[PDB]
Amino acid sequence: SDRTCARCQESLGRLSPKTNTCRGCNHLVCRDCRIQESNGTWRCKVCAKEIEL
Ligand SMILES: [Zn+2]
Ligand SMILES: [Zn+2]
């Protein structure tokens, strides 16, 4: 409840949790745990990774 990454558990502070929330997990993810998705958004390393289902 302090705004910490959901992959590395790091302080978000000046991260902006308004849009820094994986659209596939709904959790927080710093600008280092996000993978530029070919689409018009981004998905954590756990989502953008190579895996389905
Ligand atoms: Zn995710
Ligand atoms: Zn992170």
UniProtKB/Swiss-Prot annotation:
Annotated zinc fingers (FYVE-type), start-end: 5-47
Subcellular location: Membrane; Cell membrane; Cytoplasmic vesicle, Secretory vesicle membrane
Description of how the protein assembles with itself and partners: Part of a ternary complex containing STX1A and RAB27A. Can bind both dominant negative and dominant active mutants of RAB27A. Binds STXBP1, RAB3A, RAB8A and RAB27B. Interacts with MYO5A.
Known function: Modulates exocytosis of dense-core granules and secretion of hormones in the pancreas and the pituitary. Interacts with vesicles containing negatively charged phospholipids in a Ca(2+)-independent manner.
Protein name in the entry: Synaptotagmin-like protein 4
Residues of the full protein shown: 59 to 111 of 671
